[PDB]
């Protein structure tokens, strides 16, 4: 079944589980043609596959060549995601394979179920949570490797940098989701908040800056204020 605010602690128990977000798989820019029609131009995308307990990110880069001469591209994207996930599971040793895969959008459930028929003990599930994973391309080093890619490519990351040395996965996940929601709601302000202080820096082997515990609190506070600020701006409050 579906995942929601009642069984929210399940994410951080000891059964291996992955989230799969396909929002940035198929990406297009829309422009006018010389004759005044509209045409799309695809750009590189990525499948966002994340273990919420460990912070391991399996970033499958989707090169535009994948789409060449194919029809019905938004629908193929869902089936290309399912195939990539399935191949990833199969490349993992058995004791590393997920018990559950949670998809962030319901259209992914059938493509993934069909591709995973070989894995009848792996549960494929939707979520009622609204997770801001589409904003993963607002993280500069992920955006960079995606746009630079010349070929299909799997790139591994920990989206929690070193946080788990100091906090629980439950809190790391909360922080990540709050950071990503901020970036989705107002990316430029969100980024300003992360680099407004020029003294604090991002280690070359990390994604996010090297905030002290006390500075993370402040940052977390500023992101919540941003989301709240944008809410008011939006609805006039």
């Amino acid at each position: 079944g579906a995942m929601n605010s009642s069984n929210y602690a399940e994410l951080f128990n000891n059964d291996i589980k992955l989230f799969v977000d396909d929002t940035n798989v198929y990406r297009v820019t829309v422009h006018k043609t010389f004759e005044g029609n509209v045409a799309t131009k695809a750009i590189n995308g990525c499948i966002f596959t994340l273990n919420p307990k460990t912070g391991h990110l399996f970033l499958k880069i989707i090169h535009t060549s994948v789409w060449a001469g194919q029809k019905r591209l938004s629908q193929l994207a869902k089936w290309k995601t399912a195939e990539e996930v399935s191949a990833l599971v199969r490349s993992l040793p058995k004791e590393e394979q997920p018990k559950q895969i949670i998809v962030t959008r319901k259209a992914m459930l059938d493509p993934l179920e069909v591709h995973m028929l070989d894995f009848p003990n792996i549960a494929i599930r939707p979520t009622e949570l609204r997770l801001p994973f589409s904003a993963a391309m607002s993280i500069d080093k992920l955006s960079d490797v995606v746009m630079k890619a010349t070929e299909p490519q799997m790139v591994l990351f920990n989206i929690y940098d070193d946080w788990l040395d100091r906090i629980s996965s439950y809190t790391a996940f909360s922080r990540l989701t709050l950071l990503l929601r901020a970036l989705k709601t107002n990316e430029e302000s969100a980024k300003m908040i992360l680099l407004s202080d020029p003294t604090i820096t991002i280690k070359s082997y990390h994604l996010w800056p090297s905030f002290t515990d006390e500075q993370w609190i402040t940052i977390e506070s500023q992101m919540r204020d941003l989301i709240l600020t944008e809410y008011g701006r939006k609805y006039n409050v």
């Binding site: 399912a82 059938d110 493509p111 591709h115 028929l117 070989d118």
Partner: protein
């Protein structure tokens, strides 16, 4: 012509014989049905006046033996049985015919309803779905489950329809996941038609038998099987043109025969709307589409 004799009618009962229904009163001098048209399977079915629980009945073919009905007061139902003494049988039937104790199957020479609902149905295939080999006839009722239903509970008393499941390894070739899931022609033509049923006539036979079992006994599993088999054809891009033309005719007479008051439970809105307006075969069922629109526009 042929006949099905009753020792008696001890309990008041509504008797069905193919698409005809009529009432018998407790201990009315009823001894059976005559002039049953040779050349078709038939079904004789029952709904006790006093206990609408369990519609039940018997599929039979008069060319395979002499069959009669005698009420069993222990098990509480009208049972079908075979008389092996052919001579005992004609004698008994002639007596009741002479005394006019038999109602007359009114075969009409401008009605092809029964033919059109059982064209592809053959007793030999019925007896493989309904397993009870010491009899030449086959018992069915309201509550019998299907093999597939008993996968998600006695196997002796189950309907062995051909399992269909669109999200199974049988339906879906490795490396053709998307292709086989959006276009089921592989599953229809290689797996089912060439593989399991061998030809389209045995597929249609099961499909028709399934429908009749849903309609006459309200068997929920049979209804599922009938929709599953419609959906598999409709969802395939590639179907011999002869199958589609025939399928169109089959459904038309099913839709025509269905009681109007039973359509809310025996017809699945999703399956029909998909099949008539979204599926690969949307344009291929003109006659079925016309009768469904004009008769049950509500469902669409």
């Amino acid at each position: 012509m042929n006949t099905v004799p009753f020792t008696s009618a001890p309990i008041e009962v509504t008797i069905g014989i193919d698409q005809y229904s009529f009432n018998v009163k407790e201990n009315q001098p009823f001894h059976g049905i005559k002039d049953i048209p040779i050349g078709h399977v038939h079904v004789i079915h029952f709904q006790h006046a006093d206990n609408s629980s369990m519609r039940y009945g018997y599929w039979f073919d008069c060319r395979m033996g002499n069959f009669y009905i005698q009420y069993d007061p222990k098990d509480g139902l009208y049972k079908m049985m075979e008389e092996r003494d052919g001579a005992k049988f004609e004698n008994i039937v002639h007596n009741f015919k002479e005394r006019q104790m038999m109602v007359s199957y009114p075969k009409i020479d401008e009605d092809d309803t029964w033919y059109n609902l059982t064209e592809f149905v053959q007793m030999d295939k019925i007896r493989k779905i309904v397993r009870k080999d010491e009899n030449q006839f086959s018992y069915v009722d309201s509550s019998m489950t299907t093999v597939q239903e008993n996968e998600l509970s006695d196997p002796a008393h189950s309907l062995n329809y051909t399992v269909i499941n669109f999200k199974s390894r049988e339906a879906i070739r490795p490396g053709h996941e998307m292709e086989d899931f959006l276009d089921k022609s592989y599953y229809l033509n290689t797996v089912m038609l060439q593989g399991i049923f061998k030809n389209s006539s045995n597929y249609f036979g099961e499909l028709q038998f399934a429908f009749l079992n849903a309609m006459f006994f309200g068997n929920y599993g049979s209804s599922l099987q009938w929709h599953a088999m419609i959906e598999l054809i409709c969802s395939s891009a590639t179907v011999p043109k002869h199958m589609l033309d025939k399928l169109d005719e089959i459904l038309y007479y099913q839709i025509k025969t269905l009681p109007e008051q039973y359509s809310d439970i025996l017809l699945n809105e999703r399956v029909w709307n998909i099949c008539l307006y979204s599926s690969f075969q949307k344009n291929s069922l003109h006659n079925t589409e016309k009768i469904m629109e004009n008769k049950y526009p509500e469902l669409l």
